[PDB]
Amino acid sequence: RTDCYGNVNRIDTTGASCKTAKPEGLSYCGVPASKTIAERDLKAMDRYKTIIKKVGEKLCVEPAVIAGIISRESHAGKVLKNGWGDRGNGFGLMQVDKRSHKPQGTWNGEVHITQGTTILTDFIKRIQKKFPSWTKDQQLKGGISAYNAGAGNVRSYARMDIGTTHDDYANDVVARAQYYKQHGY
Numbered sequence: 598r599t600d601c602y603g604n605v606n607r608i609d610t611t612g613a614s615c616k617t618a619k620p621e622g623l624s625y626c627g628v629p630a631s632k633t634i635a636e637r638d639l640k641a642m643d644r645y646k647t648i649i650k651k652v653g654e655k656l657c658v659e660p661a662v663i664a665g666i667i668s669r670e671s672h673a674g675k676v677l678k679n680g681w682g683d684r685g686n687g688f689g690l691m692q693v694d695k696r697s698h699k700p701q702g703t704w705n706g707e708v709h710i711t712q713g714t715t716i717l718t719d720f721i722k723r724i725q726k727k728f729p730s731w732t733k734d735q736q737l738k739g740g741i742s743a744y745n746a747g748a749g750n751v752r753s754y755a756r757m758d759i760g761t762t763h764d765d766y767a768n769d770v771v772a773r774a775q776y777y778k779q780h781g782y
């Protein structure tokens with residue numbers, strides 16, 4: 598069961614801002630750019646497809662949502678130095694921030710994906726309490742954007758991502774996720 602917290606395909610997304618898409622070399626932004634980046638990491642991503650599915654089933658989270666964070670956080674490993682982020686604070690495929698969380702397991706194993714998803718799941722739960730009038734789907738998006746900047750940043754539905762990295766964390770990650778549902782996650 599992977600549908601306890603909402604379904605990614607029902608979320609409304611603007612995709613990647615141009616601060617996210619230009620760096621990567623695209624000439625366009627939004628959902629198209631989001632999906633295109635996502636598609637670039639799929640070969641690499643598919644290297645961990647069994648671990649990403651095991652844990653999503655374990656945690657009642659949608660594997661697409663985990664692949665979306667993994668594509669945005671480290672590019673399914675590609676941009677990491679021994680699982681380290683270039684400023685050295687983030688660790689593993691989901692880039693668990695060591696300042697905030699003592700990292701567990703190896704940078705690309707199940708112990709690491711479980712921990713990243715457990716953190717994701719606590720912020721989703723945190724947003725369900727904060728905003729009970731929202732829909733599950735809306736609380737799932739909130740969770741995802743909180744995953745990057747803290748739940749304190751989720752104040753609203755509509756300007757939740759302002760203050761995240763590139764002002765598009767959950768919009769991006771929600772659009773890459775939708776691409777991975779379409780392709781095996």
Ligand SMILES: CC(=O)N[C@H]1[C@H](O[C@H]2C[C@@H](C(=O)NCCS(=O)(=O)O)N[C@@H]2CO)O[C@H](CO)[C@@H](OS(=O)(=O)O)[C@@H]1O
Pocket residue numbers: 670681682683684685686687688691692693694695697698713716743744745746747748
């Ligand atoms: C999973 C987790 O750690 N999420 C936390 C998130 O942290 C970001 C940092 C980034 C990252 O690693 N940046 C790269 C830095 S480096 O590699 O260049 O050095 N990877 C994480 C999600 O994107 O930041 C918060 C504080 O702003 C914490 O809210 S909190 O309120 O609970 O603090 C959330 O706990």
